[PDB]
Subunit: 457 residues, 3 copies
């Protein structure tokens, strides 16, 4: 006999297929390679970055923690498994009481004494109904589930390292742009100086020029700080100072990652890490019902051993001192104040809770992937659209640039051209990044990179 | 006896009445209707949204979770309650040992044997001092508390759903604004294209006219994305794909809720969910001192049973095999290494912790409501004040619109009109939301939606 | 014996010294006083704020909690100490059974009875291999750790309060700047009203002049709200409404704190709080291996007591009734299905996990200080460079101010002067703050304020 019920994974309560239209590309359908099976070494192309992932994996503690965390639950599974088996031991015991008149067999105050040394168990429970096999399962699951959770955690170390490198490099490009426009700003302000002591530039076109230059001298220092902060942001996730012998790193403008299929939603149910932890996490608690159930049932204890006894010590390892005990026991509950029903329910409930929980994780995937397909299905278009506000403004730069020094126009159109452009340059870089984020997190949500390499069928 | 001490709820260590002045309206005083008793189906007027709340209730797993949680702690209370009662059962046991000479009663190796099937309890505790009623109350409390926390949770589900539907609708409204100003922008650029190949529009006035249009073409894509992101944001909290047959949903510009009375601070204590869990939480640990105390006291144990025995199996259910046992026990400790003291302390402290925690939650309510009263007491004012920067800009738009195509002026003052307007438009939508937000959160803070309906004394 | 392994604090896996260069000042080297040893009543110079810290110390509930927690862990340690010691009790027990023929000593149904009242211990474990001592140390450690963590959390209450006071004052300075430029803006608009009903000011120059004043009347209400929100932010951390009798608080422009030495990283290991909790946290589980080891070894039980007994109650405290027992026992397991291996692993692992955690905490310290040194090594320069964009913009304000009313120029170069100035003003305050922030947090990460006073050598 064994009392665990029939696992029956619930039906994923999200839409059968991802929603569409209002920013969503076409639904490619069943993918022949899941993102899950697509290794980040492939999905990331930037090899200097790739080898940063390398270093983060082999170093980041929070992943270590999450790795050991498994070794624990295997160990905890072990301990549970043992309890199917009987605890055998060598054991010596004494006893040496005075009794009173009415008690000693002598009818008068005497002092009994028993000694024994033996090899056997006390109170071994003989799983007939599998109260134990159940428990063993609970912890087996809670183990397996932990395995998953580890996988779940790496994909996130990867993603977060991608991301960090990116805000780092991105902020690096947010910087050099500031260098260029610093030399530019100051050269501009110096040609509105000779031209001032020469009266051609007024004090207004001089103060303006000063607000440009100063407007830059500030966003210099900022994208300096936010460079070091992004650097610090990195070595952490690394667990190692960044090595010197890094490969040649690329630049945001490139094409750094593979475009990844989004498959069906149902796909998740066999591939998204946490969503499996969830499942086993559920499974364990289902076991815990079996365990509960069995407490309604006859438990068969068994004490038993064998060795040598006597009345004084001395005659222990001497002839005939041989002894032994056989002491089985069958017990069965007739009244607890529904204690049993009560803590059977607690367990059934806890199942249900984990059912619910499975369902929450699932329904959170849909969300997190959809957000990334909105993002996929919008960011490209925003990338062309902002690419234009660069050109239009670089021309609307050159033209006003010359037109100011040509007496036709003022400085306010020179200046405002500079805003209308610089803004478009920063926001450009940043837009690039967040398209990247969007894709990296998208990579994750569909199964991320447990795999270094890509694998098939 | 029962050594649980006298609960004496502390005094809510915040200001007596909500602070005033620097952005706070008038303090209406005791409200005849607590926001608490005011049901969201009333406090929300948008019936489409209302019914979304409905769906999010019947569906969200996170609530399911938190709801079961109760049931668990009920069962947990059950389990503790059964402990007052004796654990009764059928029970069979054997024993069958060889003894050595000095130990068998025959003075010579013989083999004893005892068999017994009885119906009784072992070491049942009589609750005299109420160590057990104590635990029972601890568990009852951690249960009741858990009821509260469920209520707390739902209010946050409501609030968060209102909010989602909102930023969703607010980004919907953020969008059509960009449809409009897209057709507007391109119309404008094309009337600065005929006018270009015709020489009336320069190349500058063609490149600015290109950056307005371009600056739009991207804020299109963005508010196209941040719409699917907010959509995705919804079905989650829904736990269900949004049904088709929803009523007619309204628009931010309306008047979607009931203004809510802010009542007195004192009011929180009897109505704001979490602030009760806190209390009961505190109360649970209060009992847990009772418990500790009692282990200083005489504990009464009791083993007792009756049925048949014998010296070989067979003669069990036969005549005279009748047996029984009565075996009472009294224990009173006269030395642990101050164990009982130290472990009493723990539970005392733990009460104190929960007192402190009660106080925390109280003082966090004050804050979170007051923030909503600065919010109430300024958002309307920023709503009129921003309503103006729309009109003044729409005029400073019609004007410069004509004035540019009338050759009096340039394009820079057409463009800057466009900025200084569209800016005020978006900022207006967002300021609408944030006012709303602030009010939903305010609703919550004062006792939120437990009740679908609004109920009287 | 004592099987607790030999603690060996791992080597702090970060860079030997603070990263340098791309925004980092000079690395002053070992500091003669750690930021740790330096007092916040000295590091902070605003004495009004200083007494805000005083207030938030003597009150804040979250720190209280955090403090009680210690006491509880002392208590828990206590209880674990006690187990070295034997559990002594006065104790009474009875027994009264009807046997059947073959079992009664009378060969025919009769009813036995035994009574006793004795002062002793049962099953006291003699700590030989120090399994218990081990545990004692475990809970001692986890206690000591809890001590550190408390200190940890105080530094953070300070930091959070410095902060809230700041963003408070910073938002106040953000406000009066708005009062000023409101009287300014309305004056301006009315001088472009007399001049409008007089023809000199156009209708465009009146709608621009209307969107300035309207852009201000708006940013009034906002910075009015985010001051009551930054107020509510404060009394919370305070745990008390802000006293009337505070001293004279300063203004962001001052020099409110002591610049602090950032010493060697190594210094962290001996001074930054959480990094210690972790260490002890590590040490605790270190002991936990000792404890596990020992279960491989013989355990030595000892039931033992003394008193008076008899066969009927009566002759209890009557002559001869004297009795006693001595009943020692040694046990050594020979087989558990690897249970002891497994549960030894779990404990070994749990050490290694705490190793990992020590390492991660250290590695987050680096990060959080480096960020503060980028910050320290940039904010000064962004402060001079933003100081300039103020002057350049107030000049480029006075100029265009007179120049507009002197007919030479339009209003757009009055308005854009106003933007390019006021924006520089707001962002100037904000920048002041974020520098301050960066510096408070810096002071925290390197030991923060345990000490009100500064101590040395
Ligand atoms: C679930 O009840 C499975 C068993 C029922 C089938 C037949 C009976 C077999 C078990 C009898 C138990 C007695 C022997 C146990 C001694 C240790
Ligand atoms: C706290 O317990 C104070 C009272 C003293 C208790 C001492 C022991 C005597 C109690 C007698 C109770 C009889 C009740 C019978 C059970 C149904
Ligand atoms: C851990 O408990 C290991 C157990 C082994 C202990 C060894 C016992 C040795 C006994 C001799 C001690 C006599 C002391 C005289 C010294 C001069």
């Amino acid at each position: 006999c064994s009392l665990i019920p029939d696992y029956q994974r619930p039906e994923a309560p999200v839409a059968a297929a991802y929603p569409q239209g209002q920013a969503y590309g076409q639904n490619t359908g069943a993918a022949a390679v899941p993102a899950a099976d697509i290794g980040w070494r492939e999905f990331f192309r930037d090899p200097q970055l790739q080898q940063l992932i390398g270093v983060a994996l082999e170093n980041n503690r929070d992943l270590r923690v999450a790795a050991l965390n498994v070794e624990a639950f295997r160990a905890q599974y072990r301990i549970q498994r043992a309890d199917l088996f009987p605890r055998i031991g060598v054991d010596g015991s004494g006893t040496r009481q005075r009794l009173p008149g009415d008690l000693s067999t002598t009818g008068s105050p005497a002092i009994s004494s028993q000694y024994g040394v033996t090899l056997g168990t006390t109170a071994w429970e003989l799983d007939l109904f599998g109260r134990l096999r159940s428990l063993r399962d609970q912890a087996l699951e809670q183990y397996l589930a932990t395995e998953q959770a580890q996988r779940s955690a790496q994909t996130t170390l990867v993603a977060s390292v991608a991301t960090a490198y990116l805000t780092l490099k991105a902020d690096q490009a947010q910087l050099q742009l500031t260098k260029d426009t610093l030399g530019t700003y100051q050269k501009s302000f110096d040609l509105t100086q000779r031209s001032y002591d020469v009266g051609v530039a007024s004090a207004l076109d001089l103060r303006q020029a000063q607000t440009a230059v100063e407007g830059a001298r500030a966003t210099l220092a900022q994208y300096t700080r936010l460079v070091a902060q992004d650097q610090n942001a990195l070595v952490l996730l690394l667990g190692s100072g960044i090595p010197a012998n890094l490969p040649q790193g690329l630049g945001l403008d490139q094409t750094l990652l593979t475009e990844v299929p989004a498959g069906l939603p149902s796909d998740l149910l066999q591939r998204r890490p946490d969503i499996l932890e969830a499942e086993h996490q559920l499974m364990a608690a289902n076991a815990s019902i079996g365990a509960a159930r069995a407490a309604f049932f006859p438990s068969i204890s068994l004490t038993a051993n064998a060795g040598t006894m006597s009345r004084q010590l001395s005659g222990l390892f001497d002839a005939g001192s041989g002894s032994w005990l056989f002491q089985p026991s069958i017990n069965l509950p007739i009244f607890t104040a529904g204690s049993l029903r009560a803590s059977l329910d607690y367990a059934k409930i806890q199942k249900d809770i984990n059912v619910a929980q499975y369902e929450k994780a699932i329904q959170t995937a849909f969300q997190e992937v959809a957000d990334g397909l909105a993002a996929r299905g919008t960011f490209t278009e925003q990338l062309q659209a902002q690419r234009d506000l660069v050109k239009a403004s670089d021309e609307y730069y050159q033209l006003a640039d010359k037109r100011y020094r040509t007496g036709v126009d003022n400085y306010l159109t020179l200046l405002d051209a500079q805003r209308s452009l610089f803004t478009a340059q920063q926001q450009l870089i940043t837009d690039r990044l967040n398209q990247l984020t969007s894709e990296v997190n998208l990579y994750k949500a569909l199964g991320g990179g447990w795999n270094q390499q890509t694998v098939t069928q």
